[PDB]
RNA sequence: CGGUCUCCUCGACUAGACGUCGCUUGUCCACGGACGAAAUGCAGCUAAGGGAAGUCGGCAAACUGGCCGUGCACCUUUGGAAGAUACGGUGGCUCCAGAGGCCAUGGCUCGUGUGGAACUGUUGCUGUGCAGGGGAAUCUGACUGUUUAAUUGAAACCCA
RNA sequence: CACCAUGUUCAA
RNA sequence: CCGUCGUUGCUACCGAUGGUGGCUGGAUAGAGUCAUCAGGAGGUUGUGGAGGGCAUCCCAGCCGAAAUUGGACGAUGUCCAGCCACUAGAGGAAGCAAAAGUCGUAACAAGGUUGCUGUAGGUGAACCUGCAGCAGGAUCAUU
RNA sequence: AUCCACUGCAGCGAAGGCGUUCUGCAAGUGCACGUCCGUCGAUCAAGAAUGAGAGUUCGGGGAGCAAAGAUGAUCAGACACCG
RNA sequence: GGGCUGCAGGUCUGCUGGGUGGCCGGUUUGUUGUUUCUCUGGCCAGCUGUGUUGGGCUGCAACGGCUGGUACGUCCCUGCGCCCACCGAUGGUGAGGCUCCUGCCAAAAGUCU
RNA sequence: AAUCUGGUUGAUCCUGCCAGCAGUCAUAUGCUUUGUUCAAGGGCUAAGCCAUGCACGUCUCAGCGCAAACGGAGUGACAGUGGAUCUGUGAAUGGCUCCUUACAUCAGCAGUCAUCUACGUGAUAGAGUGUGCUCGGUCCACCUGCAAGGACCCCAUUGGACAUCCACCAAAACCUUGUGGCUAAUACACGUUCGACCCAGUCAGCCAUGCAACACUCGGCAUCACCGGUGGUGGCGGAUGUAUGCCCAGCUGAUACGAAGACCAGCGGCCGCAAGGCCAGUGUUGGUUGACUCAGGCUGGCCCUGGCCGCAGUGCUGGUGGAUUUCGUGCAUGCGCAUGCCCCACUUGAUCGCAAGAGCUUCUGACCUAUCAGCUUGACUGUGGUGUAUCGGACCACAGUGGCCUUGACGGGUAACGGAGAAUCAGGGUUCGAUUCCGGAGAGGGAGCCUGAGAGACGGCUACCACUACCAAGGUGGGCAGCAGGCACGCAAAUUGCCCCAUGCAAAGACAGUCUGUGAGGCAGCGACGAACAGUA
């Protein structure tokens, strides 16, 4: 789906040298066909998707297979829509308490969040997304878990 | 001057942003180097930066250090010409050296080097040492040895023009270093060159 | 036009310096030395306001540039040198020998000490890195480097350095049961043994401490300071209340009794 | 030099049965010649500085002019006004994209039809012929159509 | 069940 | 007690025709600077040779100003468009206020034609009339 | 054109509104019930559908009544009540 | 859920309409009298002891002065104390680890029955 | 103090407002005003305009002293003081103001694993270095260079300027300026042996021993061909001993769950005289984080005689002061022979942290307005680059069609700088906050820059605009929303004061001999803003 990229350049992974004569088994994964893949385990109590570890897609701005570090807030939202490429709109309906009238308001916030190609998701699924460096004008969060 | 801030860039909504300050120096930009491939002399202008540090605008570079990744060689190899760029052909036409542009380089080193190292002559040319014979045959008999069919078909023409990709940012370090393409990236860019030679 | 600010207003001064708000518009802005600006005493405050040798700013400059105020075994002539926690301040012409510590109220007191107590210092490891040529070092809270520590000296430990040689003499682990002192937050200046460390990966771990008598408080792991392997072996002399904070009714009664028994004469 | 019925109708530029030039066909016939050829005239052009001060009256001439892109106000019978007003571009060359068809994803044909870029020139390109000046009101006839062949084309007649 | 309009200003 | 009408004053509205100020956007020309392409005034070192060290020359090198080309940033002028704010106006038309001006008596009683509502027409002014409704009516009530 | 009397502390309709008889057309409420579904509901900016009479539009109709108008009285006036 | 062994009151049980004071619990305040105990400085027996002066501290102690003079067991209710229902885990390494047990058979008696 | 009272009527009870009553660290004003102590004070309007003066300079023993400027004193390089000057460093802080600005600023929270850094502080630091050598520089050799070959030299420390000064001066001036001659460095340029040693590695050679007739070759012939050479294992070694930053590429930066055999090569060890069999021994590579492509480390980045690079950088100064005894053997040991020692500070610079800052970024939280309902087209995402200190449409090229919106988008308004806070406040709340502390913005409006660690600086420069000052008409200038002060504008707001005594800041700088500066700040003057305590008996 979004594993597809442009055919204007040869998209390779940064830290994997594809023409190594005698490479090591450090990135030979325990379920792959010998395909070497650099990945990491972001470590705030999250699990690296098997799709990321054993996949073929190339994604900078992916938190598992690229230099993008997850640090800062980690929020929970709902996928409003997926109409950008590898980016997805996420909404947080929260309740803001007005002090004078001792009641609450329905408020919301959207986020252009970056879904890596390691995540299966349908529109409406819940998402936990952690903050990364600015990846675009509005994108500064990566999707760390999709919950059906 | 050239400002890399977003107080002019409208809100993500689409709403205008009213600027109530003027341009700070810490968010300036400088004009692109637009490093040109030039046969002969190199031009490099030092640029005083945010902490009194140096950047090096490469104007008119000629060559650079190019690495043979599988071989760990890194010879200085005199870029011949920009052949492919990822997106815009204007930089290919005007011979602009930018990172990740594909170039033909001399490659008579990595050939004389291949001989010196392995004792293997790649093209019919167009005292002898016992220890040297021994070491060359040892490096031949090592494990991962073997020249690939896409690299030797290039190193076997009498005027080598090997395909490298530029890895440095010449407008930032004043260098046109890079790496020779090997395997699937070589096949990719050779296929692009085929496509635009035939179409 | 903006760069680094050079002044510190008297109101914006750290409150743990009992700076009087009417005695001047400015306060001496600490220099960027070993200790943090809000966890430090300027040498002018130690010389003029506490140990009133200097009657004012001019005489403080005089005393200090005459090169006989020694802080951590070396002379410091900067009137704004940020002397901080666990530093030793000697004045030889006077025979003064202090270690600057925290009282239970969270202020910097100058605890008078003796020979061996002045000939070494106690500093907590905050960072552990490797420099070029494979040199393992450990950056401490006094900002010093200690370019070759013992390999089994992990981060939050404390170290006993000899202020003469500036090398490491001992070190004390941060495991549960160690005697410990608080150096920030509301509970600063209180001494209590470590009971348990609650982990909070990605944020601040919390440390639960049992006071010398039986009280219990909590603080942050970057807020604690190890002093001693246990409540039996403190690696340094300790002030009058020995880090045992009193209740506020107890403190009020203590002040009242002191004032009354003093007025008695 | 007026008028008078129908048929055929090439090439280039072009939107073209406009306009300009050319093959085929036809023709050099209109009373001529000298003299740079007065004044005046009828025609074609220009004109500094000003710009309707000329005149009953901007009459006459001039300005504008094709196409592409952006864009366009009052008022309105909601249809218009509108090409409103206005702004930018336009050559030459070298390229880059871009649509289709046939034989069998290769051979061949293949956008005179578009967009972009680089270079270029004494800033200049609808380079010639051709080719709206525009805006704001009052009176009036709704409109389109009609009209005194040979002084009045109108506000007249007609219309729905 | 013809027609029957009006009453200067403040003060009470 | 209501409405024309009369007097004086104040407030806002409509009004041919305008005026001023500000902001934003576009177009056009474009100061200065930054970057680039050039340039080399001038200053200053060396090459051995032949004159026995002197502008001897040659050949070179280094620094280097003005000027040149040109990308950017962009002041500013002019035009255009939109918007907003303030403001002049012949005339028209309202509202309000001010002891004792004029014409009526519409309303308050069945107010002398019950009153009022919606709409339409007429009229010096209140108002009158039609249609339908209402009682807040002058009827809580008659095979 | 309109459906008197019957015609009411009567009924129906979301309201406006609805009254001779036979008849076509679809509908609603209530009631009865060991029928079905299983929360599918309440109120509602925007939006939508009905909405007396007056008024307008196009084509007919015109008895009666009746704005405007005419007109005779009444009146000080009376393009007011009344005819 | 049954319950209730077991503290106070309530279910129960019989009462109380006497007028002052000092003494004693406790030290309650200005006093003395210690010195438990660090600390201080030398001397003295080859920096440790040993008595000591100075203030610290109170194991406290009195002196005037003192003020302070409802009950057992029984049916259950909470604070707890119990018996009686049915069907997050695991795997490695250390830590500059702790605790307990720890050579052979086993009388009688002991336990599960 | 959980508070009410007067007003509609002939009287009554309500709704409802008006008015009263109270307050304000709100402003203005009228009359009146004795003392002591505190205290706001050109914010509202005109971020309008400014005459004059001052507000940023700085020197120690410790960068440069041949000024006779003052001066002790004698064969002396400089005694000392010392204006000046060059150099360094500061002028980016402070002070003022609130015009702008509506998720903007700001507050609290958080991130930089996306970054920069002068002063400060803790550590650090071994560059004759493009090939093994020729090759740090000269002196000889051999043959399209060599594989082991030599004699010296470098180490008592460089060069050229321009200042102050003298002299001639252009100009009406100008905080405008030319020229000639000396003369300094911690200025500028330039230079670096002994600051290493060893090891890795690179080149070359040699040894011991072993299967073998296979491959590729050196030697003889125009691909059919006949004899040598290299291979495996275990070692030794002659040449050098590639220091570090930036840049590019490759490698590393582990593992923390678990069972046994055969065989063929080699390598060990065991039984072994050996043959041969065999497996009992068996020590001779990893930091940080929650997470990393991070830290750190390794390797390559000279080639076949010119060519190419020249990979830019880093030398604890070719520095300064004070002190003073610098022998290599002085001490000693064992008997001069062999070994451990034989000034202290300051300071230019490089690296790594820390500290102190900054930039950017996160989450949540702002007023009125629908007589503002649709807004946006670099607009939203992506790939590849550029630029930056760094992430990023920040910019570009190519792709796509997104992004926000009645949970109020976009627009408009400012009796909008934000907050800490202020006034009331039973409770809930209402209103304000130009103003001292923090943050932002600005310096007449704009914009562009240089220097520097830091500025889009304005008591810096450049230009345009609006005003404006001097003039000898050619030219030169200006920037009080710093402190006083003036004109305007207004209802409306102070002295053209003294001083660094206190508080601080800066600098090449403790204090004094010998005046560092500071309109920051303090103290005074004016000051019924506003507070507290007394008198007028």
Short mmCIF file of N, CA, C and O (backbone and C1' of nucleotides) in Angstrom, two decimals, chain D residues 72-74 84-89 136-137, chain F residues 16-17 26-29 79-83:
data_model
loop_
_atom_site.label_atom_id
_atom_site.label_comp_id
_atom_site.label_asym_id
_atom_site.label_seq_id
_atom_site.Cartn_x
_atom_site.Cartn_y
_atom_site.Cartn_z
P C D 72 -12.03 38.67 -9.70
"O5'" C D 72 -12.81 40.00 -10.07
"C5'" C D 72 -12.28 41.27 -9.72
"C4'" C D 72 -12.66 42.32 -10.73
"C3'" C D 72 -14.13 42.41 -11.11
"O3'" C D 72 -14.91 43.09 -10.16
"C1'" C D 72 -12.82 42.48 -13.06
P A D 73 -16.23 42.42 -9.56
"O5'" A D 73 -16.90 43.60 -8.74
"C5'" A D 73 -16.09 44.53 -8.03
"C4'" A D 73 -16.54 45.94 -8.28
"C3'" A D 73 -18.03 46.15 -8.35
"O3'" A D 73 -18.64 46.20 -7.08
"C1'" A D 73 -17.02 47.26 -10.15
P C D 74 -20.15 45.68 -6.88
"O5'" C D 74 -21.05 46.89 -7.40
"C5'" C D 74 -21.07 48.12 -6.70
"C4'" C D 74 -21.55 49.26 -7.57
"C3'" C D 74 -23.04 49.29 -7.89
"O3'" C D 74 -23.82 49.81 -6.83
"C1'" C D 74 -21.77 49.77 -9.84
P A D 84 -13.58 41.17 -19.68
"O5'" A D 84 -14.24 42.39 -18.91
"C5'" A D 84 -13.67 43.68 -18.99
"C4'" A D 84 -14.73 44.72 -19.22
"C3'" A D 84 -14.24 46.16 -19.28
"O3'" A D 84 -13.75 46.52 -20.56
"C1'" A D 84 -16.08 46.02 -17.82
P U D 85 -12.18 46.70 -20.81
"O5'" U D 85 -11.72 47.73 -19.69
"C5'" U D 85 -12.24 49.05 -19.65
"C4'" U D 85 -12.15 49.62 -18.26
"C3'" U D 85 -10.77 49.69 -17.65
"O3'" U D 85 -9.98 50.76 -18.12
"C1'" U D 85 -12.22 48.75 -16.09
P A D 86 -8.60 50.45 -18.89
"O5'" A D 86 -7.86 49.42 -17.93
"C5'" A D 86 -7.29 49.88 -16.73
"C4'" A D 86 -6.74 48.77 -15.86
"C3'" A D 86 -5.49 48.06 -16.32
"O3'" A D 86 -4.32 48.84 -16.17
"C1'" A D 86 -7.00 46.51 -15.41
P C D 87 -3.09 48.66 -17.18
"O5'" C D 87 -2.24 47.48 -16.55
"C5'" C D 87 -1.98 47.45 -15.15
"C4'" C D 87 -1.61 46.07 -14.71
"C3'" C D 87 -0.62 45.34 -15.59
"O3'" C D 87 0.71 45.78 -15.44
"C1'" C D 87 -2.37 43.89 -15.05
P G D 88 1.63 45.89 -16.74
"O5'" G D 88 2.06 44.39 -17.01
"C5'" G D 88 2.99 43.75 -16.16
"C4'" G D 88 3.03 42.27 -16.38
"C3'" G D 88 3.51 41.81 -17.74
"O3'" G D 88 4.91 41.85 -17.90
"C1'" G D 88 1.58 40.62 -17.17
P G D 89 5.55 42.34 -19.28
"O5'" G D 89 5.51 41.04 -20.20
"C5'" G D 89 6.13 39.85 -19.77
"C4'" G D 89 5.52 38.64 -20.43
"C3'" G D 89 5.75 38.51 -21.93
"O3'" G D 89 7.01 37.95 -22.23
"C1'" G D 89 3.48 38.07 -21.41
P A D 136 -18.57 52.98 -15.86
"O5'" A D 136 -18.97 54.49 -15.59
"C5'" A D 136 -18.51 55.17 -14.43
"C4'" A D 136 -19.20 56.49 -14.26
"C3'" A D 136 -20.69 56.52 -14.51
"O3'" A D 136 -21.45 55.98 -13.45
"C1'" A D 136 -19.69 58.38 -15.53
P A D 137 -22.98 55.58 -13.69
"O5'" A D 137 -23.74 56.97 -13.63
"C5'" A D 137 -24.77 57.29 -14.55
"C4'" A D 137 -25.05 58.77 -14.56
"C3'" A D 137 -26.33 59.19 -15.26
"O3'" A D 137 -27.46 59.11 -14.42
"C1'" A D 137 -24.54 60.47 -16.09
P A F 16 -26.07 60.46 -3.34
"O5'" A F 16 -25.68 61.03 -4.77
"C5'" A F 16 -26.55 60.86 -5.87
"C4'" A F 16 -26.49 62.05 -6.79
"C3'" A F 16 -25.11 62.56 -7.12
"O3'" A F 16 -24.47 61.81 -8.14
"C1'" A F 16 -26.51 64.38 -6.57
P U F 17 -23.04 61.14 -7.87
"O5'" U F 17 -22.11 62.38 -7.53
"C5'" U F 17 -21.98 63.46 -8.44
"C4'" U F 17 -21.42 64.68 -7.76
"C3'" U F 17 -20.10 64.49 -7.04
"O3'" U F 17 -18.98 64.41 -7.89
"C1'" U F 17 -21.56 65.65 -5.63
P G F 26 0.97 40.32 -3.11
"O5'" G F 26 0.57 40.82 -4.57
"C5'" G F 26 -0.28 40.04 -5.39
"C4'" G F 26 -0.68 40.79 -6.63
"C3'" G F 26 0.44 41.41 -7.43
"O3'" G F 26 1.11 40.48 -8.25
"C1'" G F 26 -1.30 42.98 -7.18
P A F 27 2.65 40.70 -8.62
"O5'" A F 27 2.61 41.91 -9.65
"C5'" A F 27 1.89 41.80 -10.86
"C4'" A F 27 1.81 43.12 -11.57
"C3'" A F 27 3.13 43.81 -11.82
"O3'" A F 27 3.81 43.27 -12.93
"C1'" A F 27 1.57 45.37 -10.99
P U F 28 5.41 43.17 -12.91
"O5'" U F 28 5.87 44.68 -13.07
"C5'" U F 28 5.69 45.36 -14.30
"C4'" U F 28 5.86 46.84 -14.13
"C3'" U F 28 7.22 47.31 -13.66
"O3'" U F 28 8.19 47.36 -14.69
"C1'" U F 28 5.57 48.36 -12.38
P A F 29 9.59 46.61 -14.51
"O5'" A F 29 10.57 47.74 -13.99
"C5'" A F 29 10.80 48.90 -14.77
"C4'" A F 29 10.98 50.13 -13.92
"C3'" A F 29 12.16 50.12 -12.97
"O3'" A F 29 13.39 50.41 -13.61
"C1'" A F 29 10.26 50.91 -11.83
P C F 79 -0.43 57.72 -8.32
"O5'" C F 79 -0.91 56.45 -9.15
"C5'" C F 79 -1.06 56.52 -10.56
"C4'" C F 79 -1.33 55.17 -11.17
"C3'" C F 79 -2.50 54.40 -10.59
"O3'" C F 79 -3.76 54.85 -11.04
"C1'" C F 79 -0.66 52.96 -10.78
P C F 80 -5.01 54.84 -10.03
"O5'" C F 80 -5.50 53.33 -10.07
"C5'" C F 80 -5.63 52.65 -11.31
"C4'" C F 80 -5.72 51.16 -11.10
"C3'" C F 80 -6.62 50.70 -9.98
"O3'" C F 80 -8.00 50.76 -10.27
"C1'" C F 80 -4.60 49.57 -9.80
P A F 81 -8.99 51.31 -9.14
"O5'" A F 81 -9.50 49.99 -8.43
"C5'" A F 81 -9.56 48.77 -9.14
"C4'" A F 81 -9.53 47.59 -8.21
"C3'" A F 81 -10.25 47.78 -6.88
"O3'" A F 81 -11.65 47.63 -6.99
"C1'" A F 81 -8.15 46.83 -6.48
P G F 82 -12.62 48.46 -6.03
"O5'" G F 82 -12.57 47.64 -4.67
"C5'" G F 82 -12.85 46.26 -4.66
"C4'" G F 82 -12.37 45.60 -3.40
"C3'" G F 82 -12.83 46.23 -2.10
"O3'" G F 82 -14.16 45.89 -1.76
"C1'" G F 82 -10.52 45.79 -1.96
P C F 83 -15.13 47.01 -1.14
"O5'" C F 83 -14.66 47.08 0.38
"C5'" C F 83 -14.52 45.90 1.14
"C4'" C F 83 -13.65 46.10 2.35
"C3'" C F 83 -13.99 47.28 3.24
"O3'" C F 83 -15.13 47.07 4.05
"C1'" C F 83 -11.66 47.19 2.93
#
